[PDB]
Design a protein around this ligand. Structure first.
Ligand SMILES: CCCCCCCCCCCCCCCC(=O)OC[C@H](CO[C@@H]1O[C@H](CS(=O)(=O)O)[C@@H](O)[C@H](O)[C@H]1O)OC(=O)CCCCCCCCCCCCCCC
Ligand SMILES: CCCCCCCCCCCCCCCC(=O)OC[C@H](CO[C@@H]1O[C@H](CS(=O)(=O)O)[C@@H](O)[C@H](O)[C@H]1O)OC(=O)CCCCCCCCCCCCCCC
Ligand SMILES: CCCCCCCCCCCCCCCC(=O)OC[C@H](CO[C@@H]1O[C@H](CS(=O)(=O)O)[C@@H](O)[C@H](O)[C@H]1O)OC(=O)CCCCCCCCCCCCCCC
Ligand SMILES: CCCCCCCCCCCCCCCC(=O)OC[C@H](COP(=O)(O)OC[C@@H](O)CO)OC(=O)CCCCCCCCCCCCCCC
Ligand SMILES: CCCCCCCCCCCCCCCC(=O)OC[C@H](COP(=O)(O)OC[C@@H](O)CO)OC(=O)CCCCCCCCCCCCCCC
Ligand SMILES: CCCCCCCCCCCCCCCC(=O)OC[C@H](COP(=O)(O)OC[C@@H](O)CO)OC(=O)CCCCCCCCCCCCCCC
Ligand SMILES: CCCCCCCCCCCCCCCC(=O)OC[C@H](COP(=O)(O)OC[C@@H](O)CO)OC(=O)CCCCCCCCCCCCCCC
Ligand SMILES: CC1=C(/C=C/C(C)=C/C=C/C(C)=C/C=C/C=C(C)/C=C/C=C(C)/C=C/C2=C(C)CCCC2(C)C)C(C)(C)CCC1
Ligand SMILES: CC1=C(/C=C/C(C)=C/C=C/C(C)=C/C=C/C=C(C)/C=C/C=C(C)/C=C/C2=C(C)CCCC2(C)C)C(C)(C)CCC1
Lengths: 593, 504, 41, 44
């Protein structure tokens, strides 16, 4: 038990050790180890299985009932200032650790068969193991300096994961835009860390909390400076994750392989921006104005993503904007005071979002088997039709995911969504009704995606484009089916979506007594009933609009021209965001030169 | 302990360079010359390591190896050598960088004799600068490096190198103009005319005389170390060069001007150092800002990396005047990290210059479709250069920020303004290094670039040099306590004296 | 505390030994592969 | 002059003296004002 907790530090080291072993030999020979594709992946799979078993053992020991462990040591000491680094063991840390390890293991199990036609196979597994090791290091980190260290590591490895094929020109600018988008939040977190070390200097979180409490009690500073420092702290997860000012990096980072976005969107870059505010909750509980502006910008970006993701012809961009909308929900709930409910909503959202991205990647791979190497004719929705009879279990899994993201009967996201709406209705009625309309607006385009992707008649390609399927892949005429590789995680990730709905009920409320903040109501039922009513409204609108077809959207597009054309591109966001900034920077650098 | 070590380490390349014009008949290109020079550099680095690991202690804060030799009964030229705390890793960096630069100079055909002779002559002076503990012999060793690097950049470089070489030698002469005056001014005040270093720090001067001496020091140290009014020589110096001379140009030669900038202007006189500390901090901030904004609009491949030397030495210019123990201790680590990054990056630039003759970022569109080790090494060196925490650049700038955050006499406006400006400086500094990697490799395959020139994938020899240059940066960035204990007592004594002199 | 001398004395002899072993390794500057004297000019 | 505008940095005013003169005197004025403000603000 106690040696098991003393030796609980090599778990993020062994995937890093495997990545070092792979990368030391991949650049030394690059012709001998290039033939070895399968056992070099089997070794990484065995290391990830050992890490998953260690994570399950630590989570079982934490749920059995113990004390939160800590281990710190001196790192770059000085005469007066001493910096301590190490690892903390928390039940929330193990709860995120099992999620990260299970998601990485299922992504590697998908990429075992997804990359069976690409010559680059060993660098993909090495970079995925490096991403998993950096995320496992980011989970267990009690000091904010190593939070910044693993933040930079996640940003660098995501910059490596975006540019993989180095053939397309969109992914060239996408990684360079995403790195400076992360650099804006890194600048904000650096200013926040500088201000926090200027005021405080006790490196613990609770020590910083009660030191700031004693510095607020005995009058030494102004609360406006603490508000500016809290805004600078929040500015990190604004630009790293998706928010109102900085969210245009995510459709650029969408372009690439599907196991890349399956790790980026699930619990690694999405969960880290929430976990930074989760570790800074006693600092943020002192003043409420930063909590109100956090909830306001979360409700604003949730309202923005729902109106963007309607008229989108790409499946992965609409999935990413729905992820932005759910980020708005969980950020607004964390600003209100739905902390444990926001963490449970993040867990549920990652649980169905990884499965939904794997199903979308299976549909994309089937359309790659049908339609050739043109990506714009492959990710479009005008060609999707009649995919239910060819993909029965994949279509059923996508239906389960698209129904659990709504949850008009009692399901996984149902209780978490009603707890979020109850917290906002306790906070503010206007944001509650805004999120109530947003919850129907997201179900509208969700069921639009479900009724345009699988159900309907089979639609072919017009003869203006090329019609061949022998460019650089296999030869197949009918839409085929993945035999055993891609079908396994789609049925593994089904039973958590059933289990966490009954395990996270508000009656027993085990998640509240398991994860707590460090320090029966009928109105809940009628807000839940209003959510079911607007979900049924969204279902009955999006059903016959695309299956029956009597409210045809062409007459609706001819009806409202400017409201459609303003949100058609994205929302007229990027053409104002990049243009004058890049031109001003170019003119300033030209004048300086 | 009774044997002279540093004197023989300095004098051994100067003696061994006399065998370079001898050279029994190779009947070839000059391969015995480089095979002898590599062995000479290897045994010199082995002697440096063997002298460091035995006699250098970490307890005495003064000088461990103290050897004095009476040269003449005249003026005061005295061969007195001494190793300090913050100068002991500098010699081990000098020997390592010069050994790998000797090993990296394989394709030399046009006059290798004078090349390796000037290399072995500059390797003696690069240790004689850091090992001397005099006032006049230090100026002699500073003017010793005047001729050989100028001669190498004259006999080979890019285009119009004759305009750059004369400007470089006249800039170095203008740098050396003030050193003799500023050394004789502090020595001719009162009595004790002898030029011992330990007696010059105990002398007392007036306020205006110390201000004039500090101005004469800062003019030469602003000519040497590049600041925004005196950095016009550096694009012409570091853009028009080849790789094995550019390694020594961008490594220890830039830290030579920063080591003396600490050792004279803090230990000799700290009273006038505090009056120019906000000016030096603001000049380093403007340096960090101006280097990225100048290098982003540049189209040349080598000046784009040469301005990164200014962008990285601005952090040292900030951290020198921080008046903190951690801020003073992080400057040596930042200098070592910047040298180890810039030498590898400029050797890599000089290596990829031979595969693609055009030095334009527009035609370079499809160089990554054939060779992948070159692209992987460039991505690894760039990511080591920008902000990464596994390498010690982030640890060095974190030490600078932490040492500048807890300072004195700059309470309300100055710390937050300088921190907010250095934050947008580190916003601006990865932009051009990202855009270069986006424009050169990431793109379609150019047909004319393959039709005109044919590129060949890299050797396993080229992997070995970058593998030897990358591992000490990761070893320092993973465990920064290895370099701390070397000069912790010296930096503590320096900061204690600087806080004893500074009132309030 | 970690010292520098026992980790440097165990890493420098293999560093001395690998220099000549990688110096005999070549192949790019061998047949012709290049039109030039070695410098920039 | 001729080898400075070949990529995405092409503008209309690059070698005109009337623009670069006022830009240079504005940059030098802000540099001198920042140096004077940091000299008269610190140690007080
Ligand atoms: C209600 C008010 C709300 C206010 C909201 C404020 C938001 C501030 C953050 C905005 C972030 C915008 C990121 C844009 C990234 C992008 O365009 O691509 C990435 C580009 C690439 O450009 C170029 O891009 C080219 C490719 S392409 O153009 O992008 O296609 C490429 O070829 C080239 O190499 C490269 O140079 O990177 C840039 O060089 C500029 C990055 C953005 C600069 C950040 C500094 C801005 C500070 C704002 C100061 C505010 C003033 C007020 C202070 C209170
Ligand atoms: C603040 C402290 C400053 C300390 C440094 C100054 C100390 C005093 C230096 C003494 C002055 C030297 C006078 C002789 C110069 C000369 O002979 O030039 C002849 C050469 C030949 O020119 C070139 O020559 C080329 C032909 S060839 O190379 O000569 O063969 C030809 O092609 C080309 O057209 C032509 O341009 O000119 C140059 O190379 C330009 C460099 C000249 C160096 C002068 C240093 C003076 C700097 C003033 C301080 C600047 C301050 C900046 C901040 C405001
Ligand atoms: C502590 C933090 C440390 C951070 C370190 C950051 C390193 C960043 C490196 C980024 C390199 C980008 C290259 C992208 C791929 C490419 O184009 O080249 C592909 C070539 C392969 O060659 C060729 O590759 C071809 C495949 S293909 O072209 O890519 O399709 C193949 O066909 C051919 O046979 C073969 O010759 O290069 C390789 O893949 C060699 C491996 C380089 C990858 C490094 C792995 C990183 C491990 C981290 C270790 C951490 C150390 C911790 C220390 C305690
Ligand atoms: C002072 C020290 C400063 C730090 C310097 C660091 C030195 C580290 C250098 C190693 C990086 C090597 C990169 C080579 C990679 C490379 O580019 O070369 C590859 C080379 C083989 O290449 P080939 O010539 O086959 O080329 C491949 C072609 O055939 C293509 O098919 O492999 C070798 O034989 C070297 C293997 C490394 C062997 C390392 C052995 C280390 C032994 C250490 C013994 C320790 C004893 C410890 C006792 C406690
Ligand atoms: C601050 C600035 C805000 C500016 C943007 C405004 C955002 C405001 C929100 C408007 C919604 C989006 C409109 C644009 C979005 C848009 O343009 O696309 C809406 C979409 C149009 O069809 P598509 O975009 O699929 O069409 C693509 C084709 O047109 C291509 O030819 O379908 C609708 O018309 C359905 C709307 C019925 C809605 C009525 C259903 C009844 C709802 C239930 C009753 C309860 C009331 C609840 C509240 C409604
Ligand atoms: C302490 C040294 C500080 C550096 C000072 C050196 C300044 C550079 C020398 C002047 C240029 C000489 C060209 C001569 C021309 C010459 O006679 O040799 C010319 C000879 C020709 O060899 P190559 O094979 O290059 O011939 C050209 C062929 O490639 C045909 O294309 O080159 C050498 O062997 C260079 C030998 C070094 C010659 C310089 C030796 C200087 C010894 C004295 C150094 C000072 C001692 C100071 C007291 C300690
Ligand atoms: C997520 C974070 C993960 C971070 C993990 C990173 C850990 C890094 C910490 C390093 C500091 C280690 C200090 C321990 C070392 C220690 O405590 O023992 C030091 C020990 C000294 O032995 P003794 O004290 O018995 O020796 C007394 C005698 O030395 C007296 O002369 O042995 C060593 O010298 C080991 C040999 C160096 C071995 C170097 C290993 C690395 C070699 C890599 C070669 C390059 C590989 C290239 C591949 C291409
Ligand atoms: C929280 C939040 C927010 C935020 C946002 C953001 C994220 C922003 C950004 C930020 C930023 C983005 C910042 C920046 C700024 C800074 C600055 C403004 C800088 C400056 C610059 C300069 C200063 C330059 C110039 C110069 C020259 C010309 C040369 C050298 C010198 C000098 C440096 C002077 C808001 C409110 C929206 C709302 C929502 C939430
Ligand atoms: C001489 C010298 C030094 C040193 C010291 C030391 C301390 C050493 C080492 C240390 C250590 C203890 C380290 C080690 C560890 C780590 C590692 C081992 C790493 C790894 C890496 C690798 C191997 C990789 C590779 C690569 C990659 C990553 C990718 C791409 C490619 C390449 C190749 C780059 C000093 C500092 C005084 C300074 C001066 C000089």
């Amino acid at each position: 038990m106690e040696p098991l907790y003393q030796y609980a530090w090599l778990i993020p080291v062994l995937p890093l050790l495997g990545a070092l072993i792979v990368g030391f030999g991949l650049i030394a020979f690059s012709e001998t180890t290039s033939k070895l594709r399968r056992p070099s992946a089997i070794f990484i799979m065995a290391l990830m299985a050992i890490a998953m078993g260690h994570s399950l053992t630590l989570f079982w020991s934490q749920v059995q009932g113990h004390l939160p462990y800590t281990q710190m040591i001196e790192w770059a000491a000085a005469g007066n200032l001493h910096i301590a680094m190490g690892y903390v063991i928390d039940p929330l840390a193990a709860l995120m650790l099992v999620i990260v390890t299970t998601v990485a293991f299922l992504v590697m199990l998908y990429s075992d068969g997804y990359m069976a036609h690409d010559p680059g196979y060993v660098r993909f597994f090495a970079y995925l193991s490096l991403f998993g090791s950096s995320m496992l290091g980011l989970v267990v980190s009690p000091n904010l300096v190593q939070v910044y260290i693993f933040w930079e590591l996640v940003g660098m490895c995501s910059y490596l994961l975006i540019g993989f094929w180095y053939d397309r020109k969109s992914a060239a600018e996408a990684a360079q835009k995403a790195f400076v988008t992360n650099r804006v939040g890194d600048f904000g977190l650096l200013l926040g860390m500088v201000g926090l070390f200027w005021a405080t200097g006790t490196f613990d979180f609770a020590g910083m909390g009660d030191r700031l409490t004693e510095l607020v009690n005995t009058g030494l500073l102004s609360p406006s400076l603490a508000a500016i420092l809290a805004i600078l702290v929040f500015l990190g997860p604004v630009a790293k994750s998706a928010q109102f000012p900085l969210h245009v990096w995510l459709p650029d980072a969408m372009e690439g392989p599907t196991p890349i976005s399956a790790l980026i969107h699930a619990a690694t870059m999405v969960a880290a921006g929430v976990f930074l505010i989760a570790r800074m909750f006693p600092v943020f509980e002192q003043l409420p104005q930063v909590m109100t502006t956090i909830a306001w910008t979360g409700a604003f970006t949730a309202f923005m993503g729902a109106t963007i993701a309607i008229t989108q012809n790409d499946i992965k961009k609409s999935l990413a904007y729905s992820t932005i909308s759910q980020l708005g929900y969980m950020v607004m709930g964390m600003g209100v005071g739905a902390y444990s409910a926001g963490l449970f909503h993040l867990m549920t959202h990652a649980y169905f979002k990884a499965m939904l991205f794997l199903g979308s990647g299976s549909v994309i791979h089937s359309m790659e088997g049908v339609v050739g190497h043109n990506p714009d004719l492959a990710q479009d929705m005008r060609y999707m039709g009649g995919l239910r009879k060819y993909m029965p279990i994949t279509g059923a899994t996508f239906l389960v995911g698209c129904l659990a993201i709504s949850g008009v009967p009692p399901f996984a996201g149902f209780w978490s969504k009603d707890e979020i709406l109850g917290a906002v209705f306790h906070a503010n009625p206007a944001m509650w009704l805004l999120t109530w309309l947003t919850a129907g607006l997201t179900a509208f385009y969700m069921f639009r995606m479900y009724f345009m992707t699988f159900e309907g008649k089979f639609r072919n390609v017009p003869p203006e484009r090329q019609e061949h399927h022998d460019h650089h892949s296999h030869h197949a005429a009918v839409p085929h089916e993945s035999p055993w590789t891609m079908t396994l995680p789609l049925v593994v990730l089904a039973i958590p979506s059933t289990l966490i709905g009954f395990v996270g009920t508000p009656f027993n409320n085990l998640f509240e007594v398991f994860i707590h903040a460090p320090g029966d109501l009928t109105e809940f039922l009628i807000l839940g009933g209003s959510s079911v009513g607007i979900g049924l409204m969204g279902i009955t609108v999006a059903y016959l609009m695309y299956l029956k077809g009597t409210p045809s959207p062409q007459a609706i597009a001819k009806a409202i021209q400017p409201l459609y054309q303003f949100s058609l591109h994205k929302w007229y966001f990027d053409e104002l965001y990049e243009a004058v900034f890049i031109k001003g920077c170019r003119r300033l650098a030209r004048q300086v030169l | 302990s009774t044997f002279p070590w540093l004197t023989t380490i300095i004098l051994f390349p100067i003696v061994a360079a006399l065998a370079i014009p001898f050279i029994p008949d190779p009947t070839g290109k000059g391969r015995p010359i480089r095979w002898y020079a590599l062995a000479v550099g290897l045994i010199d680095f082995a002697l440096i390591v063997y002298a460091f690991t035995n006699f250098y202690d970490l307890n005495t804060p003064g000088m461990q190896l103290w050897e004095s030799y009476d040269w003449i009964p005249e003026i005061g030229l005295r061969w007195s050598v001494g190793a300090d705390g913050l100068s002991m890793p500098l010699i081990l960096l000098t020997g390592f960088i010069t050994t790998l630069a000797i090993l990296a100079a394989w394709p030399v055909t046009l006059k290798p004799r004078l090349f390796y002779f000037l290399m072995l002559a500059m390797y003696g002076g690069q240790i004689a600068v850091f090992a001397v503990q005099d006032m006049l012999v230090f100026f002699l060793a500073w003017e010793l490096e005047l001729i050989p690097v100028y001669l190498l950049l004259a006999i080979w470089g890019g285009h119009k190198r004759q305009y750059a070489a004369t400007k470089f030698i006249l800039y170095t002469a203008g740098s050396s103009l003030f050193i003799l005056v500023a050394g004789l001014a502090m020595a001719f005040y009162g009595d004790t005319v002898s030029f011992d270093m330990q007696t010059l720090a105990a002398k007392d001067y007036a306020l205006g005389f110390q201000l004039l001496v500090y101005a004469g020091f800062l003019v030469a140290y602003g000519v040497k170390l590049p600041i925004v009014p005196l950095h016009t020589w550096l694009p012409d110096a570091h853009g028009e060069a080849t790789a094995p001379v550019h390694m020594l140009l961008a490594g220890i030669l830039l830290k030579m001007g920063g080591y003396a900038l600490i050792r004279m202007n803090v230990d000799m006189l700290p009273a006038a150092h505090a009056k120019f500390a906000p000016v030096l901090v603001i000049l380093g901030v403007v340096n960090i800002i101006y280097a990225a904004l100048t290098s982003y609009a540049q189209r040349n491949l080598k000046r784009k990396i040469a301005y990164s030397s200014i962008s990285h030495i601005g952090f040292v210019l900030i951290g020198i005047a921080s008046f903190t123990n951690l801020g003073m201790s992080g400057a040596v680590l930042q200098m070592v990290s910047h040298g180890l990054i810039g030498a590898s990056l400029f050797f890599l630039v000089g290596a990829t210059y031979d595969r693609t003759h055009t030095l334009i970022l527009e035609e370079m569109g499809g160089v990554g479709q054939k060779m992948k080790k070159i692209f992987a090494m460039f991505t690894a060196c760039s990511l080591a250069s920008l902000a990464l925490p596994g390498m010690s650049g982030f640890v060095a700038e974190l030490m600078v920020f932490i040492g500048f955050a807890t300072s004195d006499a700059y309470s309300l406006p100055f710390r937050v303004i300088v921190v907010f400006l250095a934050a947008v400086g580190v916003i601006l500094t990865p932009i051009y290094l990202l855009s270069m990697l986006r424009e050169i490799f990431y793109g379609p395959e150019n047909k004319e670039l393959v039709e005109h020139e044919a590129l060949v994938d890299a050797e396993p020899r080229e992997v070995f040099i970058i593998a030897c240059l990358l591992v000490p940066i990761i070893g320092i960035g993973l465990y920064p306590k290895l370099l701390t204990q070397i000069y912790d007592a010296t930096t503590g004594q320096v900061i204690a004296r600087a806080r004893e002199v500074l009132p309030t | 505390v970690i010292s520098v001398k026992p980790i440097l004395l165990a890493m420098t002899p293999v560093f001395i030994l690998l220099c000549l072993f990688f110096g005999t390794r070549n192949g790019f500057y061998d047949t012709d592969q290049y039109h030039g004297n070695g410098s920039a000019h | 002059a001729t080898d400075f505008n070949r990529g995405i940095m092409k503008f209309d005013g690059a070698d005109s003296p009337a623009m670069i003169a006022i830009s240079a005197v504005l940059i030098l004025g802000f540099i001198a004002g920042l140096i004077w403000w940091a000299l008269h603000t610190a140690y007080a």
